[PDB]
Design a protein around this ligand. Sequence first.
Ligand SMILES: NC(=O)C1=CN([C@@H]2O[C@H](COP(=O)(O)OP(=O)(O)OC[C@H]3O[C@@H](n4cnc5c(N)ncnc54)[C@H](OP(=O)(O)O)[C@@H]3O)[C@@H](O)[C@H]2O)C=CC1
Ligand SMILES: CCc1nc(N)nc(N)c1C#C[C@H](C)c1cc(OC)cc(-c2ccncc2)c1
Length: 157
Amino acid sequence: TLSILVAHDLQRVIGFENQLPWHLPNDLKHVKKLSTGHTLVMGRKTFESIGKPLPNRRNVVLTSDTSFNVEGVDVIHSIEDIYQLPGHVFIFGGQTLFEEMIDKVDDMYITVIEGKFRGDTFFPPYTFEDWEVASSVEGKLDEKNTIPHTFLHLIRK
Ligand SMILES: NC(=O)C1=CN([C@@H]2O[C@H](COP(=O)(O)OP(=O)(O)OC[C@H]3O[C@@H](n4cnc5c(N)ncnc54)[C@H](OP(=O)(O)O)[C@@H]3O)[C@@H](O)[C@H]2O)C=CC1
Ligand SMILES: CCc1nc(N)nc(N)c1C#C[C@H](C)c1cc(OC)cc(-c2ccncc2)c1
């Protein structure tokens, strides 16, 4: 199973100066729930921005750097190596990789942040004509989660 796992805002911003533009603990829990025990694939820049691999799942990084090695991180150098990955596989970031992968994945787990942030990294444009809405659940606003947001699970038609 090959999925996209992304959070973007109303204009598809997913990042600004190596950072997430927004602090939203509920989306982290959401990420932890979906991807624990499975596989996360990410481009080199996405990985360096986190700075450490995420616990209790396989971390795969795509890069052309043949010297790249990080403890707890499996390296690939080919888009094509993604399809040899066993199990449920999540394309985690960033803009470059989503652009390469958005026409290949079976489905997408999108967190829509109902805001307009300044960004420099964008999720590629997509139309609902090509995606069925399997589920749409609003996140709950509270003390620590202060931005309206929505979990979408879109499946390709
Ligand atoms: N929400 C998110 O997912 C987050 C992402 N970001 C950002 O993403 C921003 C924009 O950079 P972006 O390009 O999107 O980052 P990516 O995560 O897509 O990393 C890009 C790199 O991935 C590797 N790569 C991609 N495709 C291939 C391929 N076909 N073959 C071999 N290697 C490949 C290359 O690494 P290499 O150059 O080493 O060969 C490439 O330079 C960065 O500024 C980073 O901060 C920031 C915050 C959050
Ligand atoms: C959650 C945000 C998020 N949500 C969803 N639904 N999908 C995603 N792909 C990402 C994402 C992301 C990027 C890789 C990112 C950048 C970052 O820049 C500092 C820190 C983290 C991060 C720090 C701590 N634990 C998990 C992830 C993730």
